[PDB]
Amino acid sequence: SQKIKVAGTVVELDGDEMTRVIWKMIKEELIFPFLDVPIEYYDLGMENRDKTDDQVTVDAAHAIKKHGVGVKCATITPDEARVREFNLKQMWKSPNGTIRNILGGTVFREPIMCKNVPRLVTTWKHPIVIGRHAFGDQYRATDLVVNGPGTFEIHFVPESGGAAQVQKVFDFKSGGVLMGMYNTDESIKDFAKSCFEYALSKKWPLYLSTKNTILKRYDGRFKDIFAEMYKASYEADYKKAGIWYEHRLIDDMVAYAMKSEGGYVWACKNYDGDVQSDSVAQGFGSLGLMTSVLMSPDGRTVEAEAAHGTVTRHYRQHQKGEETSTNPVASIFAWTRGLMHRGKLDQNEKLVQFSMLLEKVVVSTIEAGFMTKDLAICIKGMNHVTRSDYLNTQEFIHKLADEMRKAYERSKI
Amino acid sequence: SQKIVAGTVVELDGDEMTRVIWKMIKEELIFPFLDVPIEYYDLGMENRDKTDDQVTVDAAHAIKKHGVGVKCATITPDEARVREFNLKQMWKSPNGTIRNILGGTVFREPIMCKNVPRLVTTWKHPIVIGRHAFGDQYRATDLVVNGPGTFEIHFVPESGGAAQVQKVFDFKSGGVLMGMYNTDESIKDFAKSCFEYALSKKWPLYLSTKNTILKRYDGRFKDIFAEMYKASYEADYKKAGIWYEHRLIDDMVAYAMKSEGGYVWACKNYDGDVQSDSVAQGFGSLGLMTSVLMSPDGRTVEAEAAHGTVTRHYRQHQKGEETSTNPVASIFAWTRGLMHRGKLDQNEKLVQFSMLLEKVVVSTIEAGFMTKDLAICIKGMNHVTRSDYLNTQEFIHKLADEMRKAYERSKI
Numbered sequence: 069s070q071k072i073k074v075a076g077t078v079v080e081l082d083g084d085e086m087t088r089v090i091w092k093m094i095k096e097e098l099i100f101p102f103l104d105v106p107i108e109y110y111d112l113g114m115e116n117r118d119k120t121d122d123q124v125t126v127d128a129a130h131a132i133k134k135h136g137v138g139v140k141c142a143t144i145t146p147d148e149a150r151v152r153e154f155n156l157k158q159m160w161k162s163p164n165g166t167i168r169n170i171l172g173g174t175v176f177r178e179p180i181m182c183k184n185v186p187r188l189v190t191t192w193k194h195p196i197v198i199g200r201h202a203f204g205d206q207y208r209a210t211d212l213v214v215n216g217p218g219t220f221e222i223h224f225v226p227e228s229g230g231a232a233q234v235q236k237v238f239d240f241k242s243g244g245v246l247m248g249m250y251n252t253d254e255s256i257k258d259f260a261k262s263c264f265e266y267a268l269s270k271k272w273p274l275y276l277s278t279k280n281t282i283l284k285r286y287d288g289r290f291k292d293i294f295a296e297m298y299k300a301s302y303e304a305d306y307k308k309a310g311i312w313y314e315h316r317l318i319d320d321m322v323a324y325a326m327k328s329e330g331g332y333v334w335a336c337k338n339y340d341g342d343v344q345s346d347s348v349a350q351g352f353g354s355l356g357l358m359t360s361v362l363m364s365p366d367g368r369t370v371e372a373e374a375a376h377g378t379v380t381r382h383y384r385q386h387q388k389g390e391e392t393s394t395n396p397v398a399s400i401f402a403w404t405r406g407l408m409h410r411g412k413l414d415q416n417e418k419l420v421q422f423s424m425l426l427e428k429v430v431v432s433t434i435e436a437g438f439m440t441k442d443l444a445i446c447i448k449g450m451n452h453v454t455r456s457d458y459l460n461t462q463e464f465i466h467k468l469a470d471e472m473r474k475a476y477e478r479s480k481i
Numbered sequence: 482s483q484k485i486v487a488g489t490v491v492e493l494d495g496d497e498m499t500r501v502i503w504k505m506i507k508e509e510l511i512f513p514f515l516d517v518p519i520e521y522y523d524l525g526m527e528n529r530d531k532t533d534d535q536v537t538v539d540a541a542h543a544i545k546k547h548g549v550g551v552k553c554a555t556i557t558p559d560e561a562r563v564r565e566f567n568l569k570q571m572w573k574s575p576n577g578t579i580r581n582i583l584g585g586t587v588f589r590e591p592i593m594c595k596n597v598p599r600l601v602t603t604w605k606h607p608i609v610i611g612r613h614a615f616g617d618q619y620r621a622t623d624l625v626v627n628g629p630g631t632f633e634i635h636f637v638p639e640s641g642g643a644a645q646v647q648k649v650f651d652f653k654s655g656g657v658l659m660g661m662y663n664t665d666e667s668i669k670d671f672a673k674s675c676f677e678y679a680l681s682k683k684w685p686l687y688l689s690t691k692n693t694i695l696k697r698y699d700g701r702f703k704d705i706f707a708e709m710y711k712a713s714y715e716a717d718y719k720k721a722g723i724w725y726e727h728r729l730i731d732d733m734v735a736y737a738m739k740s741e742g743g744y745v746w747a748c749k750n751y752d753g754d755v756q757s758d759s760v761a762q763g764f765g766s767l768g769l770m771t772s773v774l775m776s777p778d779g780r781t782v783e784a785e786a787a788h789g790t791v792t793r794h795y796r797q798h799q800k801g802e803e804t805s806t807n808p809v810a811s812i813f814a815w816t817r818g819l820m821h822r823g824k825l826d827q828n829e830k831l832v833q834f835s836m837l838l839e840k841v842v843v844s845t846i847e848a849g850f851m852t853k854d855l856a857i858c859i860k861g862m863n864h865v866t867r868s869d870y871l872n873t874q875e876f877i878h879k880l881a882d883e884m885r886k887a888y889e890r891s892k893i
């Protein structure tokens with residue numbers, strides 16, 4: 069089904085469980101009818117990441133860097149329960165963590181605002197953008213079970229060959245756990261750049277959260293890198309733009325974030341950008357109401373995703389042959405932002421107007437009273453929602469399609 | 482001033498605004514009523530630096546001895562603090578030191594005021610966070626890396642064989658590295674205390690980890706809780722109409738945001754730290770939260786303010802400007818400490834004194850007398866004016882006025 073021709077190639081990464089089911093329908097009804105789109109397909113379904121030894125994940129990452137745009141459905145990350153469940157050869161790493169490792173950059177997350185959906189948090193008047201650092205820390209770590217007594221040490225061995233630098237971290241008297249993790253100056257700096265630059269262009273303030281009182285040298289490095297770069301390259305233009313940058317302790321930032329009105333960029337270390345960008349997304353209404361875009365330092369490569377998970381409890385219900393009502397908006401906006409970036413790379417204005425148009429139609433369709441259960445909950449009580457207040461997953465997508473077909477037909481005479 | 486205590490309470494003095502407030506609470510709401518032995522330790526930054534942080538260690542060991550510890554918020558120094566106080570070094574968190582020595586779980590909970598509107602529209606009931614007090618980020622070894630090399634991790638068995646070595650990372654230019662740990666023993670301890678506490682509340686229990694990413698580290702948290710539920714707690718919980726569940730941290734923070742509450746949330750050191758601030762501020766103020774570190778045996782309580790020393794307000798204070806610093810958390814550290822002092826001494830009268838003061842604080846807030854953070858909760862941020870609240874001193878005084886009437890009012 070072709071209409072708008074797209075020269076560029078979109079690298080699509082398929083995922084798992086309920087999101088995989090919605091992914092198919094989104095392609096089927098919202099994208100392909102309108103777009104003549106070259107798709108380099110990569111199945112990051114869990115079975116296929118097992119079949120290929122996770123190499124499908126690595127190749128997909130590399131294919132995104134080549135073509136410039138990636139669009140990824142939520143995937144399962146496996147632990148022991150999951151290894152059992154699929155008879156996996158191993159506990160494979162988060163495909164997300166692997167993609168992010170290879171690409172680098174920053175994951176910008178923002179709520180998708182629907183005026184008829186009450187925010188959960190009375191104070192939040194404006195959107196918060198989270199710049200989550202995509203590299204290192206707890207997401208590329210080495211952890212270990214300890215089985216008996218013994219001493220946990222770190223050796224740093226320099227390249228020159230000067231002697232080993234060792235630290236006794238802990239004497240274990242019994243079983244326990246240990247782990248090491250890292251970050252790089254180079255990375256933190258790209259993470260500083262893109263955050264400073266995004267807030268400069270939104271004309272908004274920038275907060276950095278760390279726990280540099282505790283991790284004096286580790287988090288300390290982030291604080292100093294951001295402060296050094298601010299003085300050097302952003303203070304003058306920030307002060308001229310009527311905005312400001314400040315380091316705040318993670319403690320104080322979450323309290324501020326909860327009570328403030330929004331209108332600022334909040335830069336988080338990896339883990340905080342993981343946790344808080346869900347607290348935020350649910351605060352604004354639902355996990356399905358959020359964009360998530362991994363951006364290059366150079367602005368040429370974009371991996372757009374849904375930030376939420378595979379919606380396992382909903383899939384278990386879909387698998388019984390029971391009805392589901394799962395919010396597909398975050399999956400759809402993975403596509404639109406990917407296609408928007410695709411069109412920017414190609415000098416293709418038609419593609420950008422389509423991407424924007426699909427975002428308008430989703431938001432407008434929700435705004436006109438047509439919505440999945442989770443948004444109906446935001447409006448009507450937790451226990452005072454009924455079947456007539458919301459559309460199921462299929463209907464919602466169907467309604468969305470009806471509207472998109474109509475809007476597109478009218479759109480560019 | 483006294484009237485009411487045999488057993489001893491160990492007092493830990495702190496920094497900045499919480500210090501200023503700590504004094505007033507002792508002056509006006511505690512010592513006037515209680516004749517109590519206090520073992521005083523000054524964890525103000527100057528004395529920590531001056532004693533090479535030994536008063537902190539001494540304070541932690543005093544708490545184990547007499548069984549009750551009451552602690553004011555302290556500074557934990559980074560580089561700017563070292564400059565500011567002319568410190569010998571970037572001393573580690575005194576809280577992190579107290580907890581490393583004492584072990585256990587820090588249980589936190591909002592202090593409900595009916596005239597204070599919640600910021601989260603869905604929260605009908607309290608959320609209780611159970612924070613693992615040990616290990617992980619708060620007893621870790623972190624370094625800056627200045628040039629390329631290899632970050633290895635060695636475990637050297639007691640048995641004397643050979644080291645178990647993992648390559649973590651090949652550095653090319655500069656960075657940071659850290660190493661951190663926890664123990665089966667502490668994690669197990671953390672679980673039992675959460676299971677017992679959610680069992681006695683007849684409330685469900687959630688543990689959150691990121692075991693999909695930290696598969697062995699967080700996996701151990703998840704495996705230990707699960708095995709303990711099966712063996713020791715699943716049957717009793719099912720009889721009580723409650724459950725235990727592990728959720729991924731992503732799932733739990735989203736759930737907590739849309740839940741009505743009424744559950745005990747088991748949090749890893751880092752998560753309990755951060756999510757207890759998000760939860761206190763979601764309920765109305767950082768001022769309106771309790772925080773009680775409990776020992777595995779439950780013979781030893783350290784109570785505190787979970788929030789910081791309120792540096793921005795200390796600075797107003799220093800210039801002679803008017804402050805409205807919420808003192809309720811600092812007050813409830815006294816009351817919960819003493820509650821346990823009374824629990825230990827079988828002092829029926831002291832348990833009730835603590836209970837009464839808590840009653841009077843909230844009851845005073847609910848009669849319209851409050852500090853500026855709580856006025857901002859009722860009126861808007863931009864619509865509060867001076868007449869909606871009391872400054873810090875007046876507020877403590879109003880409570881003080883109020884507490885005397887109340888106490889005098891009781892038994893007679």
Ligand SMILES: NC(=O)c1ccc[n+]([C@@H]2O[C@H](COP(=O)([O-])OP(=O)(O)OC[C@H]3O[C@@H](n4cnc5c(N)ncnc54)[C@H](OP(=O)(O)O)[C@@H]3O)[C@@H](O)[C@H]2O)c1
Nearest residue numbers: 142143144145355356375376377378379380394395729732
């Ligand atoms: N983007 C990614 O690649 C990504 C991110 C996170 C996790 N994961 C992986 O996916 C799985 C996550 O499962 P999880 O249950 O922990 O997290 P989850 O799949 O994000 O779902 C958690 C819950 O949040 C609500 N929710 C999330 N997305 C929703 C949507 N689109 N529409 C409606 N409700 C939604 C539902 O609550 P109710 O039950 O109340 O309806 C749902 O049960 C794990 O296997 C994990 O490895 C992947």
Ligand SMILES: NC(=O)c1ccc[n+]([C@@H]2O[C@H](COP(=O)([O-])OP(=O)(O)OC[C@H]3O[C@@H](n4cnc5c(N)ncnc54)[C@H](OP(=O)(O)O)[C@@H]3O)[C@@H](O)[C@H]2O)c1
Nearest residue numbers: 317320554555556557786787788789790791792793806807
């Ligand atoms: N228990 C502890 O020992 C503990 C805990 C946390 C931090 N700290 C230490 O405290 C110092 C400063 O930390 P921080 O500035 O990150 O956080 P903070 O002192 O907790 O205060 C940060 C902000 O939260 C609000 N706030 C906190 N407590 C309040 C109260 N009792 N009444 C009214 N408002 C209150 C204020 O908001 P507004 O600005 O909006 O008025 C304040 O500016 C650091 O040295 C840190 O290491 C100690």
Ligand SMILES: [Ca+2]
Nearest residue numbers: 342343346731
């Ligand atoms: Ca997340």
Ligand SMILES: [Ca+2]
Nearest residue numbers: 319754755758
């Ligand atoms: Ca905290």
